[PDB]
Amino acid sequence: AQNPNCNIMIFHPTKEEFNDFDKYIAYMESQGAHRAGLAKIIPPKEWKARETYDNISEILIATPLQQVASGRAGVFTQYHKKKKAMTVGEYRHLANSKKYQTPPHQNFEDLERKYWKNRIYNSPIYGADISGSLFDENTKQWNLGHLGTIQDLLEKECGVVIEGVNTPYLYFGMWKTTFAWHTEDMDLYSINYLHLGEPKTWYVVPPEHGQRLERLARELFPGSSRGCGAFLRHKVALISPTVLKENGIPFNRITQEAGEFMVTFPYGYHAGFNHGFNCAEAINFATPRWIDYGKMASQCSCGEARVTFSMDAFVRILQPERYDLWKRGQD
Numbered sequence: 014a015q016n017p018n019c020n021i022m023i024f025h026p027t028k029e030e031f032n033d034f035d036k037y038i039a040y041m042e043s044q045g046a047h048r049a050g051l052a053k054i055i056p057p058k059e060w061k062a063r064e065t066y067d068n069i070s071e072i073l074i075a076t077p078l079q080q081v082a083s084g085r086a087g088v089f090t091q092y093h094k095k096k097k098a099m100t101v102g103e104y105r106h107l108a109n110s111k112k113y114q115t116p117p118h119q120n121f122e123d124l125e126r127k128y129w130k131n132r133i134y135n136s137p138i139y140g141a142d143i144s145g146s147l148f149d150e151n152t153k154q155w156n157l158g159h160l161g162t163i164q165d166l167l168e169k170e171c172g173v174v175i176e177g178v179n180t181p182y183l184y185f186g187m188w189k190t191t192f193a194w195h196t197e198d199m200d201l202y203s204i205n206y207l208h209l210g211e212p213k214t215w216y217v218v219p220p221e222h223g224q225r226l227e228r229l230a231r232e233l234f235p236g237s238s239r240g241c242g243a244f245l246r247h248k249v250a251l252i253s254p255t256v257l258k259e260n261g262i263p264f265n266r267i268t269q270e271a272g273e274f275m276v277t278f279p280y281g282y283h284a285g286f287n288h289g290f291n292c293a294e295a296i297n298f299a300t301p302r303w304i305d306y307g308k309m310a311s312q313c314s315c316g317e318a319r320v321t322f323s324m325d326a327f328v329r330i331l332q333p334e335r336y337d338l339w340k341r342g343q344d
């Protein structure tokens with residue numbers, strides 16, 4: 014078996030290899046990349062997402078989210094407090110202000126130490142889940158707005174035609190902005206391109222060990238666990254690498270820099286934080302290997318994790334037995 018220790022693999026495709034997206038994902042998996050839950054892809058030196066990022070300041074962040082923490086440094090939840098709209102230019106200025114800017118640090122490891130020591134004592138503001146794309150329409154390779162759709166994948170694999178669409182989301186981050194432990198909707202893949210700015214550090218649990226993380230989460234957030242059989246779907250729980258190690262949870266870490274892609278694989282739990290002002294673009298996608306994960310994906314039915322229009326059809330077709338109870342949480 015390839016990659017038995019479930020290490021995060023890093024790929025350097027040639028421009029020729031960068032033409033066929035599906036084929037390269039399949040290649041990565043043939044090398045065992047999916048066992049880690051996360052892979053890095055460094056694009057060919059000839060490739061660019063777009064010409065410049067000089068004219069992005071007038072993008073609107075309609076609902077910036079202030080991420081307020083509760084708990085202890087290594088085991089906490091965050092809730093999102095809605096703030097007034099601001100442009101990306103205004104957001105960048107805020108990110109760089111004395112209150113929010115990245116502190117002096119020696120290296121990525123030093124900054125990681127500072128993050129887990131001090132994150133809960135601050136409330137950074139995130140521009141998340143903004144529908145849109147920063148890929149030039151003339152960028153033909155690995156353009157996250159031009160991928161084959163999950164709906165068409167389901168149709169190709171299973172022969173059923175369904176409603177729904179599948180578009181990218183932009184994320185504007187600052188120091189300490191945080192993404193909680195989660196797998197994707199319906200345990201889909203995700204692909205994430207860091208367009209511009211400071212790095213993003215990722216943590217990931219191998220898919221074959223996802224249930225170990227779930228068990229620890231139930232122990233660490235016992236009230237949440239009683240309230241919902243899949244509360245990590247709420248995307249609000251954080252557990253530090255120190256606490257993961259103390260509890261023997263297998264995981265890996267890696268830092269993504271501007272110009273690099275990350276792919277998360279089905280049922281690969283991940284979490285992380287931004288180093289400073291940045292912009293990422295991400296979208297879910299599927300492959301034939303995803304279908305069995307989609308069938309088995311655990312759902313939030315307590316209702317906290319609202320399920321999108323498009324995910325309705327996934328549950329309806331792949332999980333017909335759960336559909337009724339699960340749609341009540343939606344309604």
Ligand SMILES: Cc1nc2ccccc2c(=O)[nH]1
Nearest residue numbers: 257258261262263264265266
């Ligand atoms: C990144 C990582 N380091 C470890 C060190 C000791 C024991 C376990 C781990 C682990 O799961 N991940």
Ligand SMILES: O=C(O)CNC(=O)C(=O)O
Nearest residue numbers: 184192203204205293295
């Ligand atoms: O970048 C973020 O804040 C969150 N991204 C993801 O969880 C992802 O790409 O799957």
Ligand code: NI
Nearest residue numbers: 196197203277
């Ligand atoms: Ni994700």
Ligand SMILES: [Zn+2]
Nearest residue numbers: 241313315317
């Ligand atoms: Zn729930």
